């Protein structure tokens, strides 16, 4: 419906401008401060080291930035591997899920080339498995609800509301198991704050995958079940979330 | 079937293990290149500037890191949270692309971002479905004239439907995969391979963030920055349609 399509476009476009205004208002001041601090660091260094021109220091910083940008660590000079078997497994998962944290980058042209085909074939393959798991999980959840639904029906609450209450319980437990439980888990395991953990969870299950926060990249010795349980989690969560995201979509179309 | 999905799980798992083996084999030998480069930069600097200790240079590099980590940029207009870049960032959310080459630093930013996405993504998905239908219509409608030619050539109507799909994607591919990659090559001074990598990482919504095109506008070429936004919208739609139908083919299989 051409009229509706253009309305929708204008709406989103406003949803973006509105977002822009807010992120700017919330983040720019921190950013402008950091820019200031970098310049303070340069000027302080020049005053301490007369053998260095501003312009030369500039090149140093550019070069240092490029290396840090490639994942160099400021702290050390040189063991643990980002591409060990476990982390590479994880990386692949980030592709087919389309999450794409990207906290570790491919450096080789062959890596990139292979990655292209790996995804083209991997994502649809995964989408299929996901649909499957979504159906199977919803089924198991629906069967489970039935037994408690029996209790509500006896208590003479209308079948129309009992279905509604069950949804509340349905998501509330899902939420409990896939949103709340993991956030509490990650809090303790990753030394993130409550808010950081929820942020991570949600960024992840939406498949946005910023990459500022990442949980399951390497295993923890003295707690073996952690690393796989997280993978298992992403699979289930993504399925639970897919069911949700379409439905908040339905509410949105209605209004 | 539950049995079948368990089988499907195992397949994927193998697709992952197989992927792991390859990326490890391909990338592990360059794990440490960036360290090595940073160290080269330090050592080169020390040799040029005798008034600087290694340890002092160390602190400089820590302090620089902290500032870059807060969103500073090396200077020699680059604000990632000015109106234009914040717009772009919001786009990366609702599209679920999530390049993340610029991170949120504030707890308020994170909190707002949560709600912004929950509401934003489904809203965008709806617009995308809409654009997908409208674009597919335009495409399929054009193809209609060539479909008329095939039908006259007494090619079976079933193959004609197939050829049209090939065309359908192939023509899109030209406009949304090939054209942009050639565009970005020239505009971003990326290589052919880097450009395709970017395009595809983007339109799959993987959004690694190692390569990013449209975050800031380019003086001396105004149409660039919007055209890219326009491109992402169309490309994503073209790509979604492929996936839904290839998904469509797959689930019945």
């Amino acid at each position, epitope marked *: 419906r051409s009229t509706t399509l253009l309305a929708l476009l204008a709406l989103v476009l406003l949803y973006l401008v509105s977002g822009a205004l807010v992120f700017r208002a919330l983040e720019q001041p921190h950013e402008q401060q950091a820019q200031r601090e970098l310049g303070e660091v340069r*000027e302080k260094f*020049l005053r301490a080291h*007369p*053998c260095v021109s501003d312009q*030369e220091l500039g090149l140093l910083i550019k070069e240092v930035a490029d290396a840090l940008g490639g994942g160099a660590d400021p702290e050390t000079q040189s063991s643990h591997s980002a591409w060990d078997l476990g982390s590479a497994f994880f990386f692949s998962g980030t592709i087919i899920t389309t999450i794409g944290y990207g906290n570790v980058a491919l450096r080789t042209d062959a890596g990139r080339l292979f990655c292209i085909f790996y995804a083209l074939v991997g994502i649809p393959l995964f989408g299929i498995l996901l649909a499957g798991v979504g159906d199977r999980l919803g089924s198991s959840l629906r069967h489970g609800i039935g037994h408690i639904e029996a209790i509500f029906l006896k208590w003479h609450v209308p079948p129309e509301l009992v279905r509604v209450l069950s949804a509340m319980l349905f998501l509330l437990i899902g939420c409990l198991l896939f949103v709340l439980t993991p956030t509490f888990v990650f809090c303790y395991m990753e030394d993130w704050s409550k808010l950081e953990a929820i942020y991570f969870v949600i960024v992840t299950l939406t498949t946005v995958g910023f990459g500022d926060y990442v949980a399951g990249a390497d295993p923890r010795q003295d707690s073996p079940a952690y690393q796989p349980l997280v993978w298992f989690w992403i699979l289930l969560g993504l399925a639970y979330f897919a069911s949700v995201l379409t439905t908040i979509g339905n509410w949105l179309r209605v209004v | 079937r539950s049995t079948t999905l368990l089988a499907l799980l195992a397949l994927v798992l193998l697709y992952l293990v197989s992927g792991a083996l390859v990326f490890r084999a391909l990338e592990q030998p360059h794990e440490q290149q960036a360290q090595r480069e940073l160290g080269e930069v330090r050592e080169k600097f020390l040799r*040029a500037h005798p008034c600087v200790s290694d340890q002092e240079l160390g602190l400089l590099i820590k302090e620089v890191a902290d500032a870059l980590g807060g969103g500073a940029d090396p200077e020699t207009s680059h604000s990632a949270w000015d109106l234009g870049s914040a717009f772009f960032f919001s786009g990366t959310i609702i599209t679920t692309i999530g390049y993340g080459n610029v991170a949120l630093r504030t707890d308020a930013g994170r909190l707002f971002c949560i709600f912004y996405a929950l509401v934003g993504i489904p809203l965008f998905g709806i617009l995308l479905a809409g654009v997908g239908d409208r674009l597919g219509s335009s495409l399929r409608h054009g193809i209609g004239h060539i479909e008329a030619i095939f039908l006259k050539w007494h090619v079976p109507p079933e193959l004609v439907r197939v050829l049209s799909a090939m065309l359908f994607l192939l023509i899109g591919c030209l406009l949304f995969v090939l054209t942009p990659t050639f565009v970005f090559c020239y505009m971003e001074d990326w290589s052919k391979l880097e450009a395709i990598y970017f395009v595809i990482v983007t339109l799959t919504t993987v959004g690694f963030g190692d390569y990013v095109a449209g975050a800031d506008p380019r003086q001396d070429s105004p149409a660039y920055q919007p055209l890219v936004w326009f491109w992402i919208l169309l490309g994503l739609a073209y790509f979604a349609s492929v996936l839904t139908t290839i998904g469509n083919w797959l689930r019945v299989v």
Partner: antibody
Amino acid sequence: EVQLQQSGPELVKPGASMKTSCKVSGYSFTGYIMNWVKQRHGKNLEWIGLINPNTGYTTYNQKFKGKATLTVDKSSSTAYMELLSLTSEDSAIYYCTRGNYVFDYWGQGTTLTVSS
Amino acid sequence: QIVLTQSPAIMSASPGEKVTMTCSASSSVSYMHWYQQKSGTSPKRWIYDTSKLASGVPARFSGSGSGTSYSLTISSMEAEDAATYYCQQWSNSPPTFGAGAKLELKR
């Protein structure tokens, strides 16, 4: 007592080029950045460029990119500036001065006259 | 290409008078420096890092400011203070100068 001693006034024909020098004493030549500055009859000061005597590194004011070449002789702790294809617009006083953030010591200046 | 404006470009003071000359920057700057020049001779670093006095300089001189606005002050004018004063910045390359403020004796 840090000191920058510049060479004497120079008189050259339009079109010619010219080289002038600045010897330092009282400190270590290679430890500090050297700059050159132009002042045209008693008016604004214009930074021309700098050289790092220790590394050979130079950067220039965009205005002077084509015009001026900075070099140094480490052994004689002397800095040089060459100016090219001179016109009467180049007639001015030119200073060498030391510093990487403030210009803390200046040569006494040298006057260039471009004339037929 | 940060631009420094000194205005007015000319001023005059009787001895004993307090003198203040300003330097406004086109965009913010962390430190300002000042040079004194007397006709016939090269500039001398006079004040640096906004408010530090160079070795030779007597106490009646002071400097202050921040961000985009900086000033040089003489608590009490003297005769030997007649000169041209220049501000300059190097918080961004390339360094730049004000066009100078010429300070003559009143009589």
